[PDB]
Amino acid sequence: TTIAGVVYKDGIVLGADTRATEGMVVADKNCSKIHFISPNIYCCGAGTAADTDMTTQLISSNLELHSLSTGRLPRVVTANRMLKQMLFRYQGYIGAALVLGGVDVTGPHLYSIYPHGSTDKLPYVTMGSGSLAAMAVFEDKFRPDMEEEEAKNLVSEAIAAGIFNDLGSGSNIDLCVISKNKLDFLRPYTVPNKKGTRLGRYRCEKGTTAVLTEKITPLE
Amino acid sequence: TTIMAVQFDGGVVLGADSRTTTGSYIANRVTDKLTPIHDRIFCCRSGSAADTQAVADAVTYQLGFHSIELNEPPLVHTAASLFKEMCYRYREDLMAGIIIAGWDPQEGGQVYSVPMGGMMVRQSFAIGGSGSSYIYGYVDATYREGMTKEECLQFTANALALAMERDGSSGGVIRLAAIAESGVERQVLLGDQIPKFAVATLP
């Protein structure tokens, strides 16, 4: 996994690759790592897949409760607190490494959140096995107050760096762009890897597989 | 990490480096390790990032509620006590080396160390974190009784610059804060602003 986030002039750009592994085998080629938290907050997930899925879902759900009650748009600091306090409670046994980004009444905010419950509030972050590749791109090229298309280029370049240099990362690049006026959930943003074209025909004709037993059970 | 705090007549100076590490990767180069617990009480954090953040958030809550109940600014010794209680009780489950420093109207400028294990001791000045090993000598030779605020800031930036030079686990920018009756003054020494001392190349 490579996930990443950037604060630009008018918002956040989040990014992620789409590979999921079981050991050193790819289980899923097009898995979605950018999670809905609220309409104005998203969260990229790296680490134990079930933990990132169940952790983001639970917090999103509690924020919907929260915002249902307050009648207000939720804040990024609230998502950050809820996540970090839960992760801290579980002492690192919930293996969720998160890039939390959104826009609220106090502007754009971006946090990285670690399995043990520490968080860092920063203008660019990366997480996952490809995070040093992605971070190298950010240190080389990030400037403050980038325009939207610059920020999107930079994030997709950072994910690509992870995709190609980390055996843990692969397949597509997904982005999410969040501003005061807009949410663009771009899945896929880029498809830099394509399965090679199938050269031979293996046309297995009917009867090729021998059958011992058959039962037809009709339905209505 | 290197952290430091110094008492002067009327206030305190606090300082930290800005490095967060996992193994020898730098997860944050510009970390802010000087966290506000109240209007005029800060803690400097070393050790586990998760632990010191969680503990600092909990003490902030405890102290804020205490302070509304009493309807008075909190004592620095009370902030230190709350840190001590939590760090001592959970010493087997926490990795946290804390300096609490600030100002209150009763005792003025104060610095308290709560090192790992959760003892508490008041000091003229305190240092902590991995990098502090490399500056015991320096601060022992340099510290003078009666330093002004500006002298305490200079002393602090020097000491941290030296530790940061030698400790792989410290580095980045120096963050300073001065706390007195009049409020909190924060600043960053970065790049060429960080005190410089020659590598001792050969004649």
Binding site: - | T1, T20, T21, T22, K33, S48, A49, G129
Partner: peptide
Amino acid sequence: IITX
């Protein structure tokens, strides 16, 4: 883990 992650330290200061």
